[PDB]
């Protein structure tokens, strides 16, 4: 792949980044 | 060289999309409510 500019940023009920994005 | 945003854990899309928006060479991020992956 390459330097894609997107990352599955899943959110919780109150938008609490419970998953860390990386893009790498 | 921000490519993990590990410190972003327990944070919010605000700071996420915010800083994530660039760090690497403009690496953005998809803000979604988990849910399935498009059927």
């Amino acid at each position: 792949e390459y330097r894609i500019d997107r990352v599955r940023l899943f959110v919780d009920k109150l938008d609490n980044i419970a998953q860390v994005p990386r893009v790498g | 060289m921000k490519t993990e945003w590990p410190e972003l854990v327990g944070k919010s899309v605000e700071e996420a999309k915010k800083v994530i928006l660039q760090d690497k060479p403009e690496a953005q991020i998809i803000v979604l409510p988990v849910g399935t992956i498009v059927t």
Side-chain angles (χ1 to χ4, degrees), chain A residues 6-17:
Chain A
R6 251 177 184 202
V7 174
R8 285 303 197 176
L9 164 45
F10 275 9
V11 298
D12 87 340
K13 314 267 122 95
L14 257 288
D15 0 308
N16 175 30
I17 316 191

Side-chain angles (χ1 to χ4, degrees), chain A residues 5 9-10 15 17 20-22, chain B residues 3-4 9-10 12 28 30 32:
Chain A
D5 86 316
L9 164 45
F10 275 9
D15 0 308
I17 316 191
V20 176
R22 241 75 47 90
Chain B
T3 88
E4 353 188 23
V9 167
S12 254
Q28 229 214 313
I30 307 161
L32 74 138

Side-chain angles (χ1 to χ4, degrees), chain B residues 3 8-9 12 17 21 23-25 27 30-31 33-34:
Chain B
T3 88
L8 179 61
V9 167
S12 254
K17 257 272 243 272
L21 177 54
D23 24 77
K24 226 124 174 313
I30 307 161
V31 59
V34 180

